[PDB]
Structure 1
């Protein structure tokens, strides 16, 4: 019997729990720490089965029904004896789960982020301590499905599923269950999983600069006058915004080349141009592909998507404060900046977007080119935990002097 613990209670947690518990020879436990969310789930389900509805390529639908072993808020019941532990939640909630699992997790456990976002490995090392050198750490690029809850604790719907997906791995001293084949078994036929070359490859290929750049391109020098309706979002960019994206992508390459030269034996060669990425994955949907401006604006998958807005005098105005900036900056752009400082590489285009975005949400992280901001302790940069060198970033070990 393979024992699995799922952490969370949203769209992603509903889908994963239902599919995994339907497999022969698997036992599933659910843990959530958001007030009394676990008691609410148990009461709504009762004696019935959980249902997952899957939309197929034909136009037909398939139903899956199962029942988990236990749903609780107690970490002693959920974590003890588990072979795999998987986190599927927004990034600001990760700190709480690492603290709760610490006294109960076994040496041979496999810890997975689905999705991890940026700074996942640094945080795990700080909280678990010496134990972090025994276990293994696995990080995925994004969520496997597009999904939404229909009825709390009872029903969830899958709108689509990716064809392929990739993940990185750091191995410890203890022997675990095989990472690639075990994860494939839980999900089914699709998506087909593969392994990436390095964990720092996965970190920077996040392209954290994308959404902040699109918002800056349209509202950067706004005078304060309203518009008739909500304008297009990806398909509404200008040539100047396209040149901004190219410059930020070039800076990602400069950082990767500097690490390989200073620390031989670390393979970061699969880090690529953003223009190369678009043509490899979106080829069937693009009408005209001769440059980056035409590749984005003529993409069929971006049809009809608009900016977030709100009602004002004589029209509409941009609505800030959702999650485009509150997650992508402290859990993304700021982490990349910390790595660049340690390598000694300047990044002027990335710096400009950071200073503008932090002011719009009322926070402070970067001051005069240094990480000394008022809210610096709420980020995931390596310097926050005391990892100040490239050797410390790679291994997790700190240097000591001798008299």
Structure 2
């Protein structure tokens, strides 16, 4: 038996629970701490089976029916004996799930952020304390699927599934179930998973600057006058924004290189240029992507047209659970990242938050971020190993 705990109750959690419980030999427990969402899920499901509708790209559709063993808000029930603990929620919820699982997580547990995405390991090391060096930590670059719930607790739709997907790993002292293949088995044939060389590679390759950069490209020195309708998102970028993305991507390499120079045995060679990343030139590569057709900026109705809607996950997530975390790493490496910095400073004010001030992580809301320094990881080796330096005597 491969005992799996799925944390969350959103789109991904529905899909994962559905796809995972359908696998032979797997026991799925759903943990959700958001009020009484578990109780709402159970009551909604009843005695029926959970349904996942997959568009095969292209083989029409597929009916996947399965039932988890239990759906609970009690971490004791969901986490005890769990071989794999997978977090599929927006990163702001991650704190609570680590806190709830901590007294119950077994040494051989594989802890997976699906996503994830930045500072996930630092947060895990902090909350789980001494047990963090025992468990394994796995960080996936994004969600496996474009998916949405069609009916709460009962029905979820997969619009499309990724071809390839990468995940990083920090091995603990405990032997877990095999990370890559177990996660593959749970997901079926697609997406085909690959193991990234290093967790910092994954963290930097998340390209946290992208959405803040695109928003800065379209609304940088925005006069405060409306536009006829919602302008194109990715396909609506200018040349200067394509340069801006290149600048920030080079800074990513700079931090990677400096980590590799200062710390041998840590392979960060798969940290890439954003143009070189895919899976003519950068500008045209973004604009002529049929995966970006008809995707528009977040807009709200105002006087004489529509204004940008800055209250969105492009900044509320991607800054504190992305750019700040990369800035925290940059500081420790001794690499100024001016282009990244300028984006942080701008996106900061737009959401009414403050993390970075004069190139230093002293902002009012820096505590709600996952930058290593927030948790006390102030050196590169403390970032890499999770061990804080203690001198005597």
The bucket for the TM-score relative to the shorter chain is over 0.9
- Aligned partners of 1:319 and 1:234: how far apart in 2? 16
Give, in angstroms, the shift of residue 367 of structure 1.
1.4
Q: Is the radius of gyration larger for structure 1 or structure 2?
A: 1
Name 1:253's counterpart in structure 2.
253
Q: Say whether 1:390 aligns with 2:380.
A: yes
TM-score, normalisation: structure 1: 0.94
Give, in angstroms, the shift of residue 202 of structure 1.
0.6
- Aligned partners of 1:271 and 1:90: how far apart in 2? 24
SS of the residue 2:378 aligns to: coil
SS of the residue 1:68 aligns to: coil
- Aligned partners of 1:362 and 1:19: how far apart in 2? 39
- Aligned partners of 2:329 and 2:58: how far apart in 1? 46
The 1:46/1:276 distance shift into structure 2, 3 A limit, reads same
Give, in angstroms, the shift of residue 292 of structure 1.
2.0
Task: Give ranges in structure 1 of 5+ residues lacking alignment.
Answer: 280-289
- Aligned partners of 2:219 and 2:348: how far apart in 1? 15
- Aligned partners of 2:59 and 2:26: how far apart in 1? 31
> Deviation digits for residues 207-233 of structure 1, max 9, x if unmatched?
111111111122111222222222222
Contact preservation (8 Å) 1:213, 1:241? yes
TM-score, normalisation: structure 2: 0.97
- Aligned partners of 1:315 and 1:402: how far apart in 2? 65
- Aligned partners of 1:133 and 1:4: how far apart in 2? 20
Give, in angstroms, the shift of residue 325 of structure 1.
0.6
The 1:198/1:51 distance shift into structure 2, 3 A limit, reads same
Give, in angstroms, the shift of residue 399 of structure 1.
1.9
> Deviation digits for residues 238-266 of structure 1, max 9, x if unmatched?
22222211111111111111111111121
Give, in angstroms, the shift of residue 301 of structure 1.
2.2
Task: Give ranges in structure 2 of 5+ residues lacking alignment.
Answer: none
Q: Say whether 1:266 aligns with 2:266.
A: yes
Give, in angstroms, the shift of residue 144 of structure 1.
0.9
Which of 259, 281, 289 is the matching residue for 1:299? 289
Contact preservation (8 Å) 1:278, 1:295? no
SS of the residue 1:160 aligns to: strand
Give, in angstroms, the shift of residue 366 of structure 1.
1.2
Give, in angstroms, the shift of residue 314 of structure 1.
2.1
The 1:400/1:313 distance shift into structure 2, 3 A limit, reads closer
SS of the residue 1:276 aligns to: coil
Contact preservation (8 Å) 1:32, 1:72? yes
Give, in angstroms, the shift of residue 31 of structure 1.
1.1
- Aligned partners of 1:302 and 1:58: how far apart in 2? 19
> Deviation digits for residues 262-289 of structure 1, max 9, x if unmatched?
111211111111111148xxxxxxxxxx
